[PDB]
Point group: D3
Amino acid sequence: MQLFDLSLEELKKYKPKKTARPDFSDFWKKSLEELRQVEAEPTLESYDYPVKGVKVYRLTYQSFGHSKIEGFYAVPDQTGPHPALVRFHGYNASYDGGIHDIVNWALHGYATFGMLVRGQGGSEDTSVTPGGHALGWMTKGILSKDTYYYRGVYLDAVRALEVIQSFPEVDEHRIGVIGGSQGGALAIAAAALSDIPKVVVADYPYLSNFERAVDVALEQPYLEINSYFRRNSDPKVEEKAFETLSYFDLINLAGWVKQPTLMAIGLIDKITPPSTVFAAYNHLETDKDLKVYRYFGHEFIPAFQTEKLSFLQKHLLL
Amino acid sequence: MQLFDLSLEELKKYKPKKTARPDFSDFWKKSLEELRQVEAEPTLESYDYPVKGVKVYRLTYQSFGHSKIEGFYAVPDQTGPHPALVRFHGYNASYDGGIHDIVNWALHGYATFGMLVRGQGGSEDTSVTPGGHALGWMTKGILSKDTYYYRGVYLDAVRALEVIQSFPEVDEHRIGVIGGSQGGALAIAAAALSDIPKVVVADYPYLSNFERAVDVALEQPYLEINSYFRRNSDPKVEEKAFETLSYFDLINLAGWVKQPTLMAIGLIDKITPPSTVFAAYNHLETDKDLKVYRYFGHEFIPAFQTEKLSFLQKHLLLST
Amino acid sequence: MQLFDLSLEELKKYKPKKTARPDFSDFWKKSLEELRQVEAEPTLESYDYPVKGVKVYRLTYQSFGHSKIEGFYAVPDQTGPHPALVRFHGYNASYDGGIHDIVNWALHGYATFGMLVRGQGGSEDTSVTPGGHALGWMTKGILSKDTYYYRGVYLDAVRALEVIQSFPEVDEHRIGVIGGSQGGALAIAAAALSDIPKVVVADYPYLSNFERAVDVALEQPYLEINSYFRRNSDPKVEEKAFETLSYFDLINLAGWVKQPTLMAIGLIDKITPPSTVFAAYNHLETDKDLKVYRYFGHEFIPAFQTEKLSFLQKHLLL
Amino acid sequence: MQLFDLSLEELKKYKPKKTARPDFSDFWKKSLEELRQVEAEPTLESYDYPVKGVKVYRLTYQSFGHSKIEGFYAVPDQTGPHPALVRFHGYNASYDGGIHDIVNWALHGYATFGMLVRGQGGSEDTSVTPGGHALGWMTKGILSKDTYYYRGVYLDAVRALEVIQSFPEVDEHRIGVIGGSQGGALAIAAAALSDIPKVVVADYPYLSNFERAVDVALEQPYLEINSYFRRNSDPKVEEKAFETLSYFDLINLAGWVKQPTLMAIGLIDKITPPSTVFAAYNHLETDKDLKVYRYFGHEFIPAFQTEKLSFLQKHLLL
Amino acid sequence: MQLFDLSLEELKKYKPKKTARPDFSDFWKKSLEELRQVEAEPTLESYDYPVKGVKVYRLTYQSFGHSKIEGFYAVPDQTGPHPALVRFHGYNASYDGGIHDIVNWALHGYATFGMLVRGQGGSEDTSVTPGGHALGWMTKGILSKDTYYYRGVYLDAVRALEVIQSFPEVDEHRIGVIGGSQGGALAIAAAALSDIPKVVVADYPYLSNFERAVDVALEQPYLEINSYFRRNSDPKVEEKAFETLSYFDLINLAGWVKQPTLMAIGLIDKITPPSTVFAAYNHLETDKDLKVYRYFGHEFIPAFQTEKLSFLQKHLLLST
Amino acid sequence: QLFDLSLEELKKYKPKKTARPDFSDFWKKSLEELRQVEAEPTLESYDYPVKGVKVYRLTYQSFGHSKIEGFYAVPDQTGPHPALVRFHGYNASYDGGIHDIVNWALHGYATFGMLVRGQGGSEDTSVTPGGHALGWMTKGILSKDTYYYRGVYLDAVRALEVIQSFPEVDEHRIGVIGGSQGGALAIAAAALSDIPKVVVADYPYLSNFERAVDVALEQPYLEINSYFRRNSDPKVEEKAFETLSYFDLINLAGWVKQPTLMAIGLIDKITPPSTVFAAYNHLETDKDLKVYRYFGHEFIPAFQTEKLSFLQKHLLL
Ligand SMILES: [Cl-]
Ligand SMILES: [Cl-]
Ligand SMILES: [Cl-]
Ligand SMILES: [Cl-]
Ligand SMILES: [Cl-]
Ligand SMILES: [Cl-]
Ligand SMILES: [Cl-]
Ligand SMILES: [Cl-]
Ligand SMILES: [Cl-]
Ligand SMILES: [Cl-]
Ligand SMILES: [Cl-]
Ligand SMILES: [Cl-]
């Protein structure tokens, strides 16, 4: 689906000015505090699955707004402690909790939890819908950072790490966060808001450089924002919307990541445009690496899977 | 586009068996009771608009789950009482509250309120999201009739009539409910749950004959249900989902409509398939009429607009 | 969606060199004279419509080439004089004469006439077809300014104003011309050829900057010209065609507009490209204003409708 | 691609009831009389073309409504008399008069004239546009058989035969009419209105069984009629339109064809649906044959080209 | 994206007449003999991969026409014997030998070999191209059963089983063949031509009921045959082509399958139409089961993966 | 609509050659392997409904002992006749393009429409070394010796040698023509053989591969992209372009000494304007490029006139 974004030479140098508001840090500090006021009260229930050498469970826990978050948790059937992984799924891309992939990760030796994103693949979302918005989750409660959809999601991700880390069979010093697109963004955001994860792997991360994204993306779901503005023409609404988005934009959160990070990008990706991903990457100040794949788009990239397994193995499995 | 559904001869005879559960009526009785428990507490605020002979306001009121419902209210700038209309908009199809259309309806002589559907064109939705569902509103809280998205919406529509009818400038005996697709469904559902409206006009109503809809529709949003089942393969989930949907299906509510009704359908409509619309119409037991337009689909039908205006004029503007 | 034309900064500065031939003014002078030679002989016939407070009629009149032009005429049912509007419809976009919209305009207080464009939404076209051309009206009689399709149409628009102006219930000093795309072009052209209209409102006007339009448009109907050249490869035909088109191009007519003008443009419009619209606007020397809508294309723009009503009310109604 | 119309078994049996009005025959009698009142006054002008053994000319002649019809005429450069062909082109499908194909036919030994259809590939159309209609020629003057676009076209086709037949280098006893789609229809109509042609070859003929066509076609140009009804919703207009169309429908004209006829049809044709073509074929009462091609649609069918050449050679050349 | 083939009720009874020629059996007997004349001469080379508990190798062996067939072979890093699987990939759908999937199967406890199909994902194809054909492999050498593309492929599949079965770490009595679409067809054909495999799992098998397939498929690659006939209009060519295809059609080979079989089909599959898959299934005379998924097409079906794993576990991993 | 470089830039676009040091040695050795195979041509009359032309089915042996075929049409009159070898487009040959071949003969040319290995006809004995993407573009791409077009190019040269040996043919008046894939074969043949007198190529394919894979929007150049997606090893991409360079028109154009006529449509999405200008700008001979603003990868009427005039001027006389 041929090249369309900036040239590779330009992408390497693309580093848009941060859009973080003066109260950026304070907002997350207060948000994390509201999260801490909710007792995790996790629950585990065995779940049958046709596989040998792995025990699967359905895990739930309380998070921001007293929402019950869920997901499958697969553990190598042998004496631990085990290195662990918190896997985040893509936007509206979760089928049956992605249980088959979770189990396979456990077979690779990792205690794995696939957190289901509020209202998408699973999990409850107690946050109210303040008013009208475009079809989808991208603009729900977008007129305020306190009501925005991803506020709860980001906090759920952090809480997921706190719950996994507390498990006896888990080695709290060998926990990684992974995911693609929406999942990549959650991995990066979690690593930025918590020092629990040791490493981060993000395939073409979403939710990055919003202001350029709405002008370059050619496919959903970034365009849900454009749809929102078409339905609410008030100029002040557009201004306020981008103000809200800035608190969740990866270009403003990347700076907080201290963990070794591995990213991937396909140069013909029309969903998460190369420029938006390079933007996030170029704002990272840590041991990092970005794998660029000329002939791939927003999809599973075989060559990167090898890089990913090698990276996780090096930093966690040992 | 182009014919694809049942032949016209078959459509006229298409009347699927009701799917209403034994507790169908009980469910709506209890739902209306929960609505009654919430005080309307309506509010009006003047809203500037470049038009002569019409006063526009932003109207809000409390509804099911203590949700603040909103919408524009336009009134003919003259001594009343005035006949009134509650207009419902299409699925994810509301731009700036559809104020221009609301104003024009008022210019036609109707005190008009365009209720904004929860989370779509406006209005607050306090109902929580019980769990995962497909992109969109169609499957939100679908695993239970108590949590389903349209429960609140239907009640908001009923409450809209109760608020409008209480206005002194409004003639409670000349109120009509209108809308297209999602709007047509809300108009029919409101008239089925309330005897406040005198007449109903619904352009190719949505939310009808769900079990056939998911197998015949070729475009969104009925297909959101198909998407939901793809993401939740548990067979019991599909069973449960259709159980929930039956409580809101027009083929089960149509029987309660006693008001004169006018409907429209384009034979090449791929969003609200002709068969699903005929299904709703054929379940109506009242003074009714269905205008069939061979060359149109899910869109504005000029010829029908004339039928609509004539119908509302005869029952509301020039009556009583 | 997505942007594709010149950047907004460039659009504001885009002002292509006029393409008007030295006999430009003489051609229109002669054309207006041929028009004058035809007696209007207008006729009115009451037309029933389910609306209170407005009387509707079917209006007809003779124009260039002795063609019978038609359209619906709606009048506020109250003592006048009334401010008036001549509304022009879009290319092949007239359904049942657009009667519903005409009636609504009258309900807003304007004596309104919706002129039907020759052979499209209605009206007779006595102009002969000189020879072959591409499917559509864009290239009919394009090998000569005297035979070109829009010659008659532009003249009909002028004659429409002369007929409306003569009505007793109409206040000749408060007449406006409005329309979108093809309609916007007719409104501008009529205001350029006649001083009868007081104001002009044109939504993304068509028939502007032809030479750039054929190289930037991505949808019909500008592309009908490209289709024409594909079917008639003689190089002299292309030269001749653009020569003809120049006599009707808004960039050459805009300079004659003296009335206050309001225009609109969506930055993702693929039918009437932003650059072609800015070109027409930038050639206007009058009290003007161009509303730019980032998220809209060739469609009804709600926010602009408010601007439009406000503008018409300020100059005509109040 | 794929099948979509009636099964082959049903197609062979499909023979819709004629829709010809009681004055069908009288209408064409009167039309042919109005044509006779116009002097052909043909003109020939040498036209240079890079080919040896063939002389090319630009031919023009007067027809119905005093319209100047044109087209290229190629003649084998050798002593005649020569068998001849009048080739009709497809709807809006004529490029540079189809000169290359005309010359090739001459190289095959046929004095060939490629009549250009009014306003399409060439030729003048003096018939006025009575009123509004949909984009295209299909609905021009459709509210009356006297004003309908194809009335002049059909007569031009007949006049083409009268002109060619009069040429000294042409053997009036060996003239054939050929064409595809619109061209096939003109060939059949011409053979139905004139006994000049000896044989007929029509590739998937258009303008056949209109009432079924508007309900089965999936592509232009039959759908222009549907577009017309969308823009003019009056029920009486639909009734009137089909009334007019019946006078030009091949299912009503086929019965007059006495010449040997060869037809072709691709079972996945979405422009001229199989059922509409079988309809025309099944209404023919003459030496006929229909070649059915399962894997082809509205396009050049190689296998049929061989059938065509053999057929013309058998009846004309040899 | 929506129902289009026969109704479910009709699909269950769809069983087209076999098209096998009188020399069907003799052709395969002769072909297997030509294969036997080629010494396998397999080779193994360790291949590094970032995984713990599994050893991966690049495997090659000689097959029909002395073609060198290749593929990745992953083995559980523990004392055997191990149950084994021969996995076949989809049409032009092999990326880097599908190594990641092969390794995962080994992690599930199966010695797995992912045979690469001639000229597609890998492996050499020594068979000559007799003449012109349409873009793709579907019509290569189609004018003769001896030259047809899939003759070598089917034999390679059989030889794959003979090679895997000879490995000491492999339990010859617990070998399964799996694959989707083209892979499903290869699995079924292999099980039909060899009694080495114990069980078969085929996701919406391709190469089935060719004569119906070319008239119902809406996407590639069945349509490559239609393309072929467009380019070679001789009627005798079409007749000859279908004669050749009959020797490889699953509806003619299914009858030879004696192993327990598990199949899947999505009702909206446009590539391998439901009718063509039901046809293959209904021609099977063995312990069988067909999983039908209403909302899925030609894609990975989550729910079926669970069925597959349970099935293989029951017959291979947890048995003997 | 326009999408490639501007016309002004296209006229100046001349990418650096990618030919390897052994470029000429490779073709010299390949032509020698071809010479090793005896043509042993055969002719069989073929019935066709046309007067004044005799049609035959011609076959001959070529590289790898592959039997190449095609229709051969001859003006039914005393020769010698000027001749043409016509090459068809990628996967675009229907029934050998017999109708077009016959028409060329009616124009006065003894014409042979060579069918490209495995496409419109002809046998391809070259083995498939390993996996490749759907299509012929990447068959045997990991080596210049095994690449699909090696045999095809040699078949084209052999076609000229066979036609030239016919008594009814005037060896000094032979032209090579074709569009896209056919244009490339015409140019390649004229580059590898001095037999043809003139060349006419409509928007030639197989040119400037490295830019083609980044600019083309439709098949079949994109088959290469598909290949890389299925074989991600970086060394494979490097090797693949190494192989392709031996067949790229920008490296072969320099050998063409015959008068050449080319055409290009500015909205061509299959053979992008830049790749065609690239080939043209690498030609050092009597040449001319016809540019058609409103056309793409299709039959261009105006160019057909240029083509006939050009062939008539240089051959027919
Ligand atoms: Cl909000
Ligand atoms: Cl993508
Ligand atoms: Cl739910
Ligand atoms: Cl629709
Ligand atoms: Cl003209
Ligand atoms: Cl647009
Ligand atoms: Cl008319
Ligand atoms: Cl077609
Ligand atoms: Cl073959
Ligand atoms: Cl599918
Ligand atoms: Cl290779
Ligand atoms: Cl193209």
